[PDB]
Every structure is written in C-alpha cells, then in structure tokens.
Amino acid sequence: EALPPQKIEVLVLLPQDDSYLFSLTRVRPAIEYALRSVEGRLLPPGTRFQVAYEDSDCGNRALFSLVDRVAAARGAKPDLILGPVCEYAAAPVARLASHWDLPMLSAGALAAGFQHKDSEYSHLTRVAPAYAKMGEMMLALFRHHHWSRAALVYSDDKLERNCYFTLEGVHEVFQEEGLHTSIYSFDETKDLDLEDIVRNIQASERVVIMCASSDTIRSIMLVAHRHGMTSGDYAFFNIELFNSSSYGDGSWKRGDKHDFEAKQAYSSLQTVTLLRTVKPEFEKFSMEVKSSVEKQGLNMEDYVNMFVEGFHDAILLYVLALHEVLRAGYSKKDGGKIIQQTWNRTFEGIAGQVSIDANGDRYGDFSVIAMTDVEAGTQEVIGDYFGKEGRFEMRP
Amino acid sequence: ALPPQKIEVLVLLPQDDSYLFSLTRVRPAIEYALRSVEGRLLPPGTRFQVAYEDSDCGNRALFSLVDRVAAARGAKPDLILGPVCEYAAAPVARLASHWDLPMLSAGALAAGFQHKDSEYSHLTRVAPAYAKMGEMMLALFRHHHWSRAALVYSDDKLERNCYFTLEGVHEVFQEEGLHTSIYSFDETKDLDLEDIVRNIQASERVVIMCASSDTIRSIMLVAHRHGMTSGDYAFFNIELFNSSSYGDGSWKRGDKHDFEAKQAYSSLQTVTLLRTVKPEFEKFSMEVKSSVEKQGLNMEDYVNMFVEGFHDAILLYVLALHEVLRAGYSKKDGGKIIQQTWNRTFEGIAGQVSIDANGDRYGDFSVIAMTDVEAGTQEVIGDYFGKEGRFEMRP
C-alpha cells in the first residue's frame, strides 16, 4: 500500500576548501552515487531528495548556516544533516540536532566526547570508526604483546587538533584499563626542538605511540636514529588512519638526501591505519567518484578515502532507518526514532559489511603496517583488528 | 524629532539560584537600571522589553537564542545580556557576532574571549576578565621580586571556574617569562591532599591556588601539619565574587579545626576585587535586596560584581546607542554599538567604570592578608589599579 511520495531535505555541512579529504566536491559524488542507488526500493515510490551543500568552513560557519537556513525557511528544518566532520564544527550542530530532534550522521566527529549520547549528542550517529575504536585496537595490540605502558607523543594545533583527539582515543581506553601513559605534546606548526622530543621519549617509555604529519614523524624518526633508538630498544607506532597507501612502496621514501637513513630509522616504526575492504562494487564506486572529482579539478587517492565511503553509506543507513520508521507509522520528523533505528545493526555498505554498535558508533577494523624486509624497505600489513569481534590477529 | 525606541533585550542567565548571577539576583539590577534610563539619552517613549531566559549555565542559552530567532514567529533581539558561564557564552557570542547583534556580559571572563578579531567581535565584558587578575598578580610578583609560582587549582571539567581563573595568570606570566608549575585535580572527587601538598613542597615557594573555600582550608590544614605555614611558603587563593569567602575570618567554620586553621591561614593571602561605594550604591543595594527577598530568598548582603556589572551593562549600552543614533545609525548596527561601548569611561552605580580599547572592563584588585595571627584578623594589605597599572601597598 505504497505510502505518499516523500520530499526528503538533507543539509550537507562540509568544507568548501578542497584541502580537506572530506570537502564538499570530494564527498558530493559519493552522496549522489548512493542516492542514485536508493531510487531503484525502501522508500515510498515517487520519493525525492533535495540536497543542499553548505560550507562548514571546518568551523563556526556550519552552525551559522544551519541556523540561518531554518530562520529563512521560517522554522522549517532539514530532515537529515550530514556532517560536519571537524570536531569543533560538529559539536554545536550535534547539540542543535538533538535539541530539534533531527537525525545527524557524520563520517567524522571522531572525538571521544561524542561518545556520551545520553543528552547532548543523542541524535548523532557516527558512520566511520571513532578514535576510541582505534584505542580499543591499540589495547588489544598491547595485550597481545603484554605491554602495559606507553609514551603518547603528538602534535597539538590548539586549532583542529586532529592528532590530539586521535591520541585521546588511546588515552581514554588505556586509562580505563589501567595502563600507564606518559604525555608529551608540541605544536608541529611552530619551530620544533626535535632533540627535546627524542630526549623526553628516552627518559619516559620504550613503546611510543605518536601522531603528527608524515613529515614531522619522519624528522622525529631521523633524530631518534642518530640517538641509536631505531635498532630495537624502542617500538614506535604512528597513526595514519586516512592516508596510508604510500606503504608497500615505502612511507619513508621522499626522493630526499635523507632517504637511506629514513629507511633504516623506519624499521622500528609500525603504522596504524584503517583495514579497508574491497568488492567490484566498491571498485566501480571509486572510479566514478574519482572521475567526477578529477574533471572537477582535483587529484585523489586511488581508492576513495573513508570519509567519502562513509558518507555514501550514511545515506544507505538513513534510508534504511527511515523506511523502517515509516512502515512503523511514524514520520521523517521523528528524528529520535530514525536515529535509534540506525543503531545496533549490520547492513551492506559500498565496501562490505558495516556494523553500528549499540551506542550509535560504527565498529572499526584496523591494520598494522610494519617493515617486513629492512634491506628493501618493504612495508606490509602484519596484523588486523576486527572491532565487532574485538579480536586482534597477526596475519599468517 | 525621533520616535519612541522599542528595544528587545534577551537576558540569558541561570534560573538556579545556586549561581551568584542567577536571573532572580540579577533581574532587579537590570530593572533598577531600566528605570533610571526610562526617565534622558534616548528619545522619550523609548521602552525596553526584556525576556529573561534560563541559560542553565550551558547549552540552553544557545537553544533559546536560536529558538527565538529561527522560529516562524521569530526576530533578532536588539541586545543580549549574558550568558556568564564560559561554555554557555562562547556559542552565543559567535552567533551575536554573526548576526551583528551587540552582546554585553558581566561574565565570559575566560582568556579566549580576548581575541575579538573575528568570532567574538560583538562582545564587551563589563566585569574584570581573568587576564586582568593575571595582570595584578604580575604586578604583585614584580613588587616582591618573585619570578616563579606553582598554580594549583581544581578543574571539574564542567564549568571549570578555577581552571579559567588560573588561566588568566598563566597567560600573563608565560607572556612575561615567569615560570609556573601546573597542578590540577578534581575537587569533586576524593582528594589526595598528601599528594597535593607533597607536589607543592617540591615545586615552588609561592603557590597560587583556586578551589572551593573548603578545599583550600583542607590543603592549608595538611600544609600546616607538614610545617609549610609560618614562613617558608607564600600561599594565595582567589575569591573574587563570593563575600562569604573573602570576608574577615575566612579560616573559621565553628569547627574542631578552627584553631589549626587560624594558624595555617597566617601564611595565606586572598585576592579579590577592589569594590567601591557611593550614596547611590546604597539605594541600589537596598532596592535590589527588596525584590530579591520579596522573591523568597536569602540574600548575600550587598550585591556581588555580577549584579553590579549587569546594571552598568544597561547604562553602557544606552550611551553607545545614543552616540550611534546621532551618527545616523540604527539599533540594528550591532557592530557600531559595540565599538561605541569600547575605550570609554562612564559612571556606574558604584563609581567610575572604564572599558579598555579591546572591549574589556579594567579591573582593580585587593590582596587580603592576616595582620594579626593571635586574633586571626585579615585586612586589605595592597591594591592594584588596572588602568593605571599600579600595585600599591596600603599605609
């Protein structure tokens, strides 16, 4: 008994600046691909989607635009908000979405604070792995080795603070479990005292978990190398969840005059990143997205990043939940019901299975990259962690 | 020549009287100012419509401003007063700036509201911000030739008053090159007084602290047992607003520890705001006290800095609105109005009030110390006048 056609209004809040992996032009092709995929069926026939793409400016702008649109539309609110991804941009929008009972899905907002959804962040469903998920994986990695202490070394912008929130994910989990952590932060955009960093590391712990730009990490590793810290006395880890495809070929390589030392230095470094699966569907998905972005004037990874994949799946998940709430006799305006429907379930995303936990946070799967052959400087994945299963396993 | 002005005011403060700046305590102050105003710098007939909304010292302040503006029946208020709470105020200030609406508060004392080049361009602070207290501490340190300090405060991760308070000191000191050791704890959790005192014992001789007065009495008691009172250490606590806490005999509780506390406090100095009075202030206080008691509540004797500042907030707004209307602009030119509230001195109900070139009220402070240990008598020992930037001990 097909319901009446629906007119779903979605507001996309991401950066216009293509410097970000989750900029509007980079993500739009994926959202459109998923909408294309949904209309031919779970929604009432004749249903249409109106999508507004708005610049979040990775900041206060996201909130301003949300508010301005509602006011201009005389109180009318979007039916679905996608993004922001930036932590400080997302928190105010999440607060309002919860207050207005609107569903908000994001492949970002990875910070630990969004974990508490009793009130403030009710209504936020995270479609990509939050930092605490990477933290749980690090705990398992530590339990695997029987390690119980670590030095956390990260760059803190005091602005977007991506690496600060990343390591907060580790700190939170480790503190819960009782592992000891030494904390050392610095601002990598300022003049660096590479020797003070390395000296603090040698005075604190032997297992070091770091997060900073690929070049800052390289600088730190080259300096640790001259202090004789790269031959086995320390176990370094760096976190590169969103762009770690340089490995296999050599994340140390820079066609630089420090290339050989870097390759040696990196024999003691392991890199944590997202375990990314593939299907022929995902492969096609990437090609189309890549083409669209390319004739748009942008370069792009060969396999669309997690933010892009995440947002594609965010639409499938919204439609999935909306379809169920509709069939149950509720409306698209019952945001809380839509949000609860997106939680605690497994569905088929563009790259495979996707499971959202009972707190509305996607389970993450992670891989560990290590140098498997020091002569060549070959880096491969030595082990994975499957979040839902909660098990870490070294690869055969 | 000019028609009656109808100014819509949105006041965002806590309904909960647990706060010294709750709606009940501050409303009387705004009303008093309103009368004084409506009877004249503004075209006669001019009337203010004031909406008092619960800020809940949190997210609700944002939700109320937006629900009022983005409603189908909505419109932008002409003036926003409050929030006071730092996390409640940040979002409102950003919006006020985006919507070109003037925002005045006796709160938003944190250092971050200092940078007004962009997001906080439409906020003028009528009460002394924490950095102003930090400037006073810098002058006090220079006076003694002190160059290092231990900052020890409670950080509850919620309203974080003491964290923001010592941040004012930290900012000024780092800028100036003085070294500070940092030690935070959550007083809302079981205290590890032994660790606190041992950490102090090992860091610096001058200790600047901020925590509830009972948290401070405890620290001081353990320090007393460790022989740290009586000379070896100079302790300071910050009690800028609550008169029950900076009043003479801050060590007394009618406790079984009252004697030890009096002796311990001989080494403690308290920083608070240097307040002034004049005939009118008394009337204002009497009148304010009247409404508040009629509203079923125990008063705090004379009114705190928030009540005073919000009364002066109205007056400063009017002065700015005048000189702006003159220049031919409207109440809707928030940016223009705010610029007029900056870099000027006017008469508040307690005495002269000066707002600096960045839209922040200049602050005067006093240091209270025990001048008679047998008696446990505490008196003002020195003052700091923010605008002149001079610290001076009293005769």
Binding site: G113, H171, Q175 | E167
Partner: peptide, 18 residues
C-alpha cells in the same frame, strides 16, 4: 598528562594550556 578522561565539553573555545 594533558589528558584525563574528562573535558567532554571540548568545544566552543580553546584558550591555551591543558
């Protein structure tokens, strides 16, 4: 440690020093 499983409110401001 600039951390401590707290400060959920990390939003709407930044100031300096943790």
């Amino acid at each position: 440690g600039c951390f401590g499983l707290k400060l959920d409110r990390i939003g709407s401001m930044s100031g300096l020093g943790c």
